[PDB]
Design an enzyme around this catalytic site. Structure first.
Site, PDB file in Angstrom:
ATOM      1  N   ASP A 181    -113.799 -40.186 -36.232  1.00 15.57           N
ATOM      2  CA  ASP A 181    -113.686 -42.217 -36.243  1.00 15.57           C
ATOM      3  C   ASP A 181    -114.233 -42.924 -36.532  1.00 15.57           C
ATOM      4  O   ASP A 181    -114.238 -43.605 -37.150  1.00 15.57           O
ATOM      5  CB  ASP A 181    -112.808 -42.194 -34.452  1.00 15.57           C
ATOM      6  CG  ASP A 181    -111.837 -42.228 -34.797  1.00 15.57           C
ATOM      7  OD1 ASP A 181    -110.351 -41.948 -36.169  1.00 15.57           O
ATOM      8  OD2 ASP A 181    -110.261 -42.958 -34.023  1.00 15.57           O
ATOM      9  N   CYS A 215    -108.374 -40.876 -48.615  1.00 13.69           N
ATOM     10  CA  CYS A 215    -108.683 -41.266 -47.627  1.00 13.69           C
ATOM     11  C   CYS A 215    -107.920 -42.667 -47.336  1.00 13.69           C
ATOM     12  O   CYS A 215    -107.247 -42.610 -47.229  1.00 13.69           O
ATOM     13  CB  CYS A 215    -110.648 -41.581 -47.385  1.00 13.69           C
ATOM     14  SG  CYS A 215    -111.455 -42.492 -48.340  1.00 13.69           S
ATOM     15  N   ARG A 221    -114.824 -41.404 -47.729  1.00 14.94           N
ATOM     16  CA  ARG A 221    -114.658 -39.957 -47.895  1.00 14.94           C
ATOM     17  C   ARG A 221    -114.187 -39.484 -49.652  1.00 14.94           C
ATOM     18  O   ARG A 221    -115.456 -38.612 -49.316  1.00 14.94           O
ATOM     19  CB  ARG A 221    -113.909 -39.860 -46.438  1.00 14.94           C
ATOM     20  CG  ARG A 221    -114.522 -40.250 -45.372  1.00 14.94           C
ATOM     21  CD  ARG A 221    -113.467 -39.812 -44.276  1.00 14.94           C
ATOM     22  NE  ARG A 221    -113.492 -40.975 -43.112  1.00 14.94           N
ATOM     23  CZ  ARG A 221    -112.739 -40.660 -42.349  1.00 14.94           C
ATOM     24  NH1 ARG A 221    -111.503 -39.781 -42.586  1.00 14.94           N
ATOM     25  NH2 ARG A 221    -112.704 -41.518 -40.897  1.00 14.94           N
ATOM     26  N   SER A 222    -113.779 -40.636 -49.855  1.00 15.49           N
ATOM     27  CA  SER A 222    -112.971 -39.843 -50.697  1.00 15.49           C
ATOM     28  C   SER A 222    -114.475 -39.659 -51.722  1.00 15.49           C
ATOM     29  O   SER A 222    -114.327 -39.083 -52.823  1.00 15.49           O
ATOM     30  CB  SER A 222    -111.718 -40.742 -52.036  1.00 15.49           C
ATOM     31  OG  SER A 222    -110.756 -40.405 -50.732  1.00 15.49           O
ATOM     32  N   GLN A 262    -119.753 -45.626 -48.871  1.00 16.61           N
ATOM     33  CA  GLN A 262    -119.205 -46.923 -48.267  1.00 16.61           C
ATOM     34  C   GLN A 262    -120.584 -47.575 -47.038  1.00 16.61           C
ATOM     35  O   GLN A 262    -120.692 -48.474 -46.740  1.00 16.61           O
ATOM     36  CB  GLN A 262    -118.238 -47.028 -47.570  1.00 16.61           C
ATOM     37  CG  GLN A 262    -116.938 -47.090 -48.239  1.00 16.61           C
ATOM     38  CD  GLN A 262    -115.795 -47.354 -47.178  1.00 16.61           C
ATOM     39  OE1 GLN A 262    -114.928 -46.599 -47.005  1.00 16.61           O
ATOM     40  NE2 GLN A 262    -115.130 -48.694 -46.919  1.00 16.61           N
TER      41      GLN A 262
END
Ligand SMILES: CCOC(=O)[C@@H]1CN(C(C)=O)[C@H]2c3cccc(C)c3O[C@@H]12
Length: 284
Positions: A181, A215, A221-222, A262
């Site tokens: 998370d 994602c 993440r992508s 990110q």
């Protein structure tokens, strides 16, 4: 400069935040006018994450052709990816229309439906064989065929039917279920095992349409997934695997979708994945 030495130099100097801001400063800025039209407000999850006009995927319909999705076309590596947001309650039918129209074999999901106690994407696939889903707005039927649950990921076989023509296709759903998370995985071992299960399936190969990768926003993440895959493929193709520059590959990918990677921690994790992954491409 061998990236493994570049890596230790940035770690010992603790300059990850500085390297990352340099990428943010040099990244491409192209118009996203279609994403910002008032008719499209409920088709975007995040006001600050939009596809560029020049690389956006168009839906094959005269009404409204808009989806929050981008074509990432990597010319030297000979790989293409579609990166998209997690589907919203009113875009689940658009999502499967895109998979159908683009002739994709695989969908790669890098999030859980709930994370941090909030919904990160719609439940857009069926959970039981005998309870299929019908998308009336796009005329598609989706059936769960089989599910294989492993410790770090789940693979599903799905049947997508175009109700207009009665054609069917097998879609593979690759669901990475253990990204934490907060932050990034301590090791890149499971994410790399996962990438290679996607490769082994045929879903990334040129006989199919581009893989669909998401994602929640479809950038963080992508972005890590496509960046690691393309850098490893370039290392196997080049005479000098040491000429692969991860920062330059990321800036090339950012010509096609904004914001890919990110955080400085996602940038460091991407370096670790390519380094630890490279200890196989090169014959181990
Ligand atoms: C910390 C990184 O070490 C790993 O976990 C392995 C590294 N790797 C690559 C392509 O380099 C992946 C791979 C390739 C073939 C088989 C497996 C089970 C596999 O898992 C990943």
């Amino acid at each position: 400069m061998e990236m493994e030495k570049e890596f230790e130099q940035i770690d010992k100097s603790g300059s990850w935040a500085a390297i990352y801001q340099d990428i943010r400063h040099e990244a491409s800025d192209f118009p996203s006018r279609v994403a910002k039209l008032p008719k499209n407000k409920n088709r975007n999850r995040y006001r600050d994450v939009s596809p560029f006009d020049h690389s956006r995927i168009k839906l094959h319909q005269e009404d409204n052709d808009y989806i929050n999705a981008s074509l990432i076309k990597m010319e030297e590596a000979q790989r293409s990816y579609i990166l998209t947001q997690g589907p919203l309650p009113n875009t689940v039918g658009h999502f499967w229309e895109m998979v159908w129209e683009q002739k994709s074999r695989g969908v790669v999901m890098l999030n859980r439906v709930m994370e941090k106690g909030s919904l990160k994407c719609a439940q857009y696939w069926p959970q039981k064989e005998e309870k299929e889903m019908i998308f009336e707005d796009t005329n598609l039927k989706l059936t769960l065929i089989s599910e294989d649950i492993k410790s770090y990921y789940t693979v599903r076989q799905l049947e997508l039917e175009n109700l207009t023509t009665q054609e069917t296709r097998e879609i593979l759903h690759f669901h990475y279920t253990t990204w934490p998370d907060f932050g990034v995985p301590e090791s890149p071992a499971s994410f790399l095992n996962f990438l290679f299960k996607v490769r082994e399936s045929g879903s990334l190969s040129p006989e199919h349409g581009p893989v669909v990768v998401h994602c929640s926003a479809g950038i963080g993440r992508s972005g890590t997934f496509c960046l690691a895959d393309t850098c490893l493929l370039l290392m196997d193709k080049r005479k000098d695997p040491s000429s692969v520059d991860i920062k330059k590959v990321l800036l090339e990918m950012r010509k096609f979708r904004m914001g890919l990677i990110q955080t400085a921690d996602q940038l460091r994790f991407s370096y670790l994945a390519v380094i630890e992954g490279a200890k196989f491409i090169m014959g181990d």
